Design an enzyme around this catalytic site. Structure first.
Site, short mmCIF file in Angstrom:
data_model
loop_
_atom_site.label_atom_id
_atom_site.label_comp_id
_atom_site.label_asym_id
_atom_site.label_seq_id
_atom_site.Cartn_x
_atom_site.Cartn_y
_atom_site.Cartn_z
N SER A 102 0.75 -1.25 0.00
CA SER A 102 0.00 0.00 0.00
C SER A 102 0.79 1.31 0.00
O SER A 102 0.22 2.34 -0.34
CB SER A 102 -1.02 0.03 1.13
OG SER A 102 -2.08 -0.85 0.76
N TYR A 145 -11.08 2.46 3.94
CA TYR A 145 -9.88 2.16 3.16
C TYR A 145 -10.19 1.09 2.11
O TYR A 145 -10.79 0.03 2.41
CB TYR A 145 -8.83 1.65 4.11
CG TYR A 145 -7.43 1.61 3.61
CD1 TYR A 145 -7.02 0.64 2.70
CD2 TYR A 145 -6.48 2.51 4.10
CE1 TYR A 145 -5.70 0.58 2.28
CE2 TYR A 145 -5.15 2.46 3.69
CZ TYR A 145 -4.78 1.48 2.79
OH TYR A 145 -3.47 1.41 2.39
N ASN A 153 -8.74 -0.59 -1.81
CA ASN A 153 -7.90 -0.64 -2.99
C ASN A 153 -8.75 -0.40 -4.25
O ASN A 153 -8.23 0.13 -5.24
CB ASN A 153 -7.19 -1.99 -3.09
CG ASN A 153 -6.07 -2.15 -2.06
OD1 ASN A 153 -5.29 -1.23 -1.82
ND2 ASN A 153 -5.98 -3.33 -1.46
N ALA A 158 1.51 -3.25 2.89
CA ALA A 158 1.74 -4.67 3.06
C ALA A 158 1.35 -5.47 1.84
O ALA A 158 0.44 -5.11 1.11
CB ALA A 158 0.99 -5.19 4.31
#
Length: 352
Positions: free
Chosen positions: A61, A147, A149, A309
């Site tokens: 990230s 959060y 992606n 990570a």
């Protein structure tokens, strides 16, 4: 390498590596603007390859900070605006939920609860379209941060559309090359495979899997030297010659939203400095956000940071612009975030 730096670094990292069973680690400290490098352990356990200053680690990230700055550079170029609707750049997104969702929402995880991950079954561009069309927001845009992606990854893809360039070409040409990040990659070339660390998960050697929007959200690999240079560029964007890139860095550190003591930038997250590590530090945490209207330009007295990570890697970057101080920590094991933040704070506190 001042002895004070050597001492705090080794005194903090050695027990971290011990307690967390990290196979290999590289650390850079930026102190008064200059980088100092440290490495330990193994990039490849089986082949007994050491970590060196040239070892490539998966940033996970932390890649979002690159996407955030690339998007900033696009805004600076007048190619996109954060106030633009998502449908301006993807008119095929016709589902009614998209009315009111802007590029700002995508970049800052405030679109209304886009999922943490794009599903593994989503591969093609048509699959991706269908995924976003089918998504049902839990919340109105600009009310909660989750959060995701699938949120910043979409931002990345749309941000480069007017340029004509692929996301990887835009990133290479507009960010990596200008900043002389010559050992930083979205796809690791065969010539550099000798330098690419294995990640370790439950003792198994692993590398990141290909996925939709991987490049945009979690797919940058880099060396401790390039990451130190990335921190220097973000500590002092004025020393960057490329006008739109300098501006893009500044836009990525502006404060768009507040939740608790934290401020959301583009990729970067920020807290006012001074701050204790307890305030700095769950598969899903939904947090109400307050808009910063209009956004605050980059504040020099900030702890600016990003944790990252992959299955087999754990990274951390933090810097304080007013003090010309920063740290990058790259490891080939995904170990707990609070342990990263504690160690970084301990080191920077001692030097501050």
């Amino acid at each position: 390498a001042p002895q004070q730096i050597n001492d705090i670094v080794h005194r903090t990292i050695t027990p971290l590596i011990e307690q967390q069973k990290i196979p290999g680690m590289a650390v850079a400290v930026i102190y008064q603007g200059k980088p100092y490098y440290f490495t330990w352990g193994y990039a490849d356990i089986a082949k007994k390859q050491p970590v060196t200053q040239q070892t490539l680690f998966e940033l996970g990230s932390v890649s979002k900070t690159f996407t955030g700055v690339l998007g900033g550079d696009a805004i600076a170029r007048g190619e996109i605006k954060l106030s633009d609707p998502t449908t301006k750049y993807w008119p095929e997104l016709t589902a009614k939920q998209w009315n009111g969702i802007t590029l700002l929402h995508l970049a800052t995880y405030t679109a209304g609860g886009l999922p943490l991950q794009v599903p593994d079954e989503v591969k093609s561009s048509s699959d991706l379209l269908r995924f976003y069309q089918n998504w049902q927001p839990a919340w109105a845009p600009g009310t909660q941060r989750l959060y995701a992606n699938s949120s910043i990854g979409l931002f990345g893809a749309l941000a480069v559309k007017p340029s004509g360039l692929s996301f990887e070409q835009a990133m290479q040409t507009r960010v990596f090359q200008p900043l002389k990040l010559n050992h930083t990659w979205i796809n690791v070339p065969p010539a550099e495979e000798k330098n690419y660390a294995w990640g370790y998960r439950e003792g198994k050697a692993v590398h990141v899997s290909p996925g939709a929007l991987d490049a945009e959200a979690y797919g940058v690999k880099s060396t401790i030297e390039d990451m130190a240079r990335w921190v220097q560029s973000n500590l002092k964007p004025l020393d960057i010659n490329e006008k739109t890139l300098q501006q893009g860095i500044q836009l990525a550190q502006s404060r768009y939203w507040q939740t608790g003591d934290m401020y959301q930038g583009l990729g970067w997250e920020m807290l006012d400095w001074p701050v204790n590590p307890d305030s700095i530090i769950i598969a899903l945490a939904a947090r109400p956000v307050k808009a910063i209207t209009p956004p605050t330009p980059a504040v020099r007295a900030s702890w600016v940071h990003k944790t990252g990570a992959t299955g087999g890697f754990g990274s951390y970057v933090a810097f304080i612009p007013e003090k010309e101080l920063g740290i990058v920590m790259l490891a080939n094991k995904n170990y707990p975030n609070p342990a990263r933040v504690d160690a970084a704070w301990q080191i920077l506190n001692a030097l501050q």
